[PDB]
Amino acid sequence: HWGYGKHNGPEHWHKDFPIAKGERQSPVDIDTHTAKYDPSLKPLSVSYDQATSLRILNNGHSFKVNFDDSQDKAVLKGGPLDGTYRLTQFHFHWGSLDGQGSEHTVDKKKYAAELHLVHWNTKYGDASKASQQPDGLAVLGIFLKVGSAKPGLQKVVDVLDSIKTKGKSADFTNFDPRGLLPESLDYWTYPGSLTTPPLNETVTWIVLKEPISVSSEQVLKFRKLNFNGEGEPEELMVDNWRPAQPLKNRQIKASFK
Numbered sequence: 001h002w003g004y005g006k007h008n009g010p011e012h013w014h015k016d017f018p019i020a021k022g023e024r025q026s027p028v029d030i031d032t033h034t035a036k037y038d039p040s041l042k043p044l045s046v047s048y049d050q051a052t053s054l055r056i057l058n059n060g061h062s063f064k065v066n067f068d069d070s071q072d073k074a075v076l077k078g079g080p081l082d083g084t085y086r087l088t089q090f091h092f093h094w095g096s097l098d099g100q101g102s103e104h105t106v107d108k109k110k111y112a113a114e115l116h117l118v119h120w121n122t123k124y125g126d127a128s129k130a131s132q133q134p135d136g137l138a139v140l141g142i143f144l145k146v147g148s149a150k151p152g153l154q155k156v157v158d159v160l161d162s163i164k165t166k167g168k169s170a171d172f173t174n175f176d177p178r179g180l181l182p183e184s185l186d187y188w189t190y191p192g193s194l195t196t197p198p199l200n201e202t203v204t205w206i207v208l209k210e211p212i213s214v215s216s217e218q219v220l221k222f223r224k225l226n227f228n229g230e231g232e233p234e235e236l237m238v239d240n241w242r243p244a245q246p247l248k249n250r251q252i253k254a255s256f257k
């Protein structure tokens with residue numbers, strides 16, 4: 001029932017998900033002048049060499065690639081994290097135009113899209129249990145700007161016409177998420193939430209400073225997806241982003257400079 005339209009969009013979500021007006025909601029605006037360099041952050045470790053992708057799916061609100069997380073294959077450690085977080089899926093948020101699409105903003109600037117690599121704390125055994133714990137999830141967020149093509153994204157864009165409508169899935173094995181990362185692992189970090197219902201306040205956000213560049217042709221392919229199921233009125237899947245939420249009593253910490 002929830003979505004991104006006038007009648008079911010982010011301003012409505014609080015009726016079914018009252019935590020929408022909570023104390024640690026995401027996304028937020030990252031005020032780069034107010035964020036404090038934190039010398040106690042350990043190096044961030046993105047270890048994706050053994051990642052095992054499975055399937056790609058149109059879920060009616062985004063498209064998602066899932067991974068085999070039955071063992072420690074692709075993990076995130078270090079930075080603000082304690083222990084080991086396993087990669088379970090990635091998805092994206094994007095706009096109708098190149099100047100909007102991202103969920104996080106940087107001094108109020110919106111990027112064309114945002115990649116979320118979703119990970120869960122292995123001390124909780126499974127992703128369901130992890131998603132109910134204050135330190136259960138970690139999302140590595142990566143901004144996309146339009147410019148030069150991103151080669152490591154092209155395999156994703158080329159399969160999207162096989163999952164046009166809600167509920168469609170396709171095989172998506174042997175995909176390497178290392179091809180989605182920028183050069184720098186400089187980041188901002190803060191405690192927050194899922195940006196989609198049920199908006200659980202269980203996420204350590206790690207947002208990279210350096211965007212990746214993607215071509216206009218790559219982002220245009222994202223905008224050909226549909227929110228609707230096959231044989232319903234066609235509604236293009238665009239502007240599937242939640243706007244910035246109040247920071248409230250939270251500090252954003254920077255890993256750099």
Ligand SMILES: NS(=O)(=O)c1cc(C(=O)O)c(Cl)cc1Cl
Binds near residue numbers: 116194
């Ligand atoms: N946008 S987000 O906050 O990364 C997020 C989205 C989803 C979703 O698939 O919609 C899930 Cl299950 C978990 C997280 Cl953590």
Ligand SMILES: [Zn+2]
Binds near residue numbers: 091092093116195
């Ligand atoms: Zn997301």
